[PDB]
């Protein structure tokens, strides 16, 4: 059960205005205790769902933006810095440009999803918050 | 000028012990690994291992793993290749090679072996 | 050993001024991690191309590399005589680090 078997480490970044997610070069890595500062550095996707709004009509709810490690989730095959439409690509400096094949991605049955969260001073889009 | 220069060429005999050096010039050593290569007479390029100069990390090829010993001396910008005991099949030329491997914001990284020594001989001859 | 890279052919023959079509493949995926090195005779090896399409600073734009997985092609637009040497591919994706048996370019007569 692959699909059902894969997701990433975080919880997800809610987009909640008009402007996609994007960070400074250096920034955007979320904090990750079980990692090591050659491990920092991965990509954003954006996930999108429809649901039935309260007038009949289908919407769109917010995006979520979920990170995954270089090298490792959907877009396992991208190198770095790979133009995409709904990825966009972190890195703290000094992090190694390799896939990190000791950090996966996370199987729901075996560990829940840590709390997304960003050094403080990280800059933010409009209508992102952490 | 980005430079790595080796030691001169060396003419030992089998079973004697050789360590050649490696020293880099006009950027941060730290900030990138160190890579050894071997070329017999007439044949390709192998791979023999690699170092982290920043905290001495090293893995070996198969082949030359317990053969010989990659090192590093970090403040004066020198890696290292030395051998226990020298064959007569050790005589090749040996290439020691920027690897570069992380994301750096103030230069264009180009990953892989970047830049390369002029190489040293050994011969290796009773 | 581990990822196994194979090039084709060994020896390539052209005259300079023709266009020159380099061949690597990987016994398994090594998504983008792929570098091209030029070994002219008597010389140390040079970089071309890194992670598989990117040139490398001081190359000639006739140099170009493609590809992704299992295959990776180098071209030389039109051959200068210079450029008749053997080349090299090499892959980072994992450990151990493994070249290609080079393929030599060397002039047709």
């Known amino acids: 059960a692959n699909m059902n078997n894969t997701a990433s480490w975080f919880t997800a970044l809610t987009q909640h205005g008009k402007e996609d997610l994007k960070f400074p070069r250096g920034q955007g890595v979320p904090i990750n205790t079980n990692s090591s500062p050659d491990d920092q550095i991965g990509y954003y996707r954006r996930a999108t769902r429809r649901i039935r709004g309260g007038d009949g009509k289908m919407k769109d709810l917010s995006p979520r933006w979920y990170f995954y490690y270089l090298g490792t989730g959907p877009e396992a095959g991208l190198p770095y810095g790979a133009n995409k439409d709904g990825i966009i690509w972190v890195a703290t400096e000094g992090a190694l440009n390799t896939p990190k094949d000791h950090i996966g991605t996370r199987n729901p049955a075996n560990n829940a999803a840590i709390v997304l969260q960003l050094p403080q001073g990280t800059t933010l889009p409009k209508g992102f918050y952490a | 000028e980005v430079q790595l220069v080796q030691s001169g060429a060396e003419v030992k005999k089998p079973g004697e012990s050789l360590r050649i050096s490696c020293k880099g010039s006009?950027?941060?050593?730290?900030?990138?690994?160190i890579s050894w290569v071997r070329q017999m007479p007439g044949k390709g390029l192998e791979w023999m291992g690699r170092?982290?100069?920043?905290?001495?990390?090293?893995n070996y090829s198969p082949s030359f793993q317990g053969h010989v010993t990659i090192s590093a001396d970090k403040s004066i910008s020198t890696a290292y290749l030395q051998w226990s005991s020298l064959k007569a099949s050790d005589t090749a030329m040996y290439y020691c090679?920027?690897?570069?491997?992380?994301?750096?914001?103030?230069?264009?990284?180009?990953?892989?072996?970047?830049?390369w020594g002029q190489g040293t001989t050994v011969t290796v001859s009773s | 050993a581990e990822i196994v890279l194979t090039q084709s052919p060994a020896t390539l023959s052209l005259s300079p001024g023709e266009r020159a079509t380099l061949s690597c493949r990987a016994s398994?995926?090594?998504?983008?991690?792929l570098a091209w090195y030029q070994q002219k005779p008597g010389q140390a090896p040079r970089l071309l191309i890194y992670?598989?399409?990117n040139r490398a600073s001081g190359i000639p734009a006739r140099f170009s590399g493609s590809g992704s997985g299992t295959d990776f092609t180098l071209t030389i637009s039109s051959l200068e005589p210079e450029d008749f040497a053997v080349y090299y591919c090499?892959?980072?994706?994992?450990?151990?680090?493994?070249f290609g048996g080079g393929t030599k370019v060397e002039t047709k007569r």
């Open positions: 090679a920027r690897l570069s491997v992380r994301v750096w914001f103030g230069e264009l990284p180009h990953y892989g072996m970047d830049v």
């Open positions: 006009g950027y941060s050593f730290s900030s990138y690994w």
């Open positions: 170092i982290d100069p920043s905290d001495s990390n090293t």
């Open positions: 398994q995926s090594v998504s983008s991690y």
């Open positions: 992670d598989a399409s």
């Open positions: 090499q892959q980072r994706r994992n450990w151990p680090l493994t």
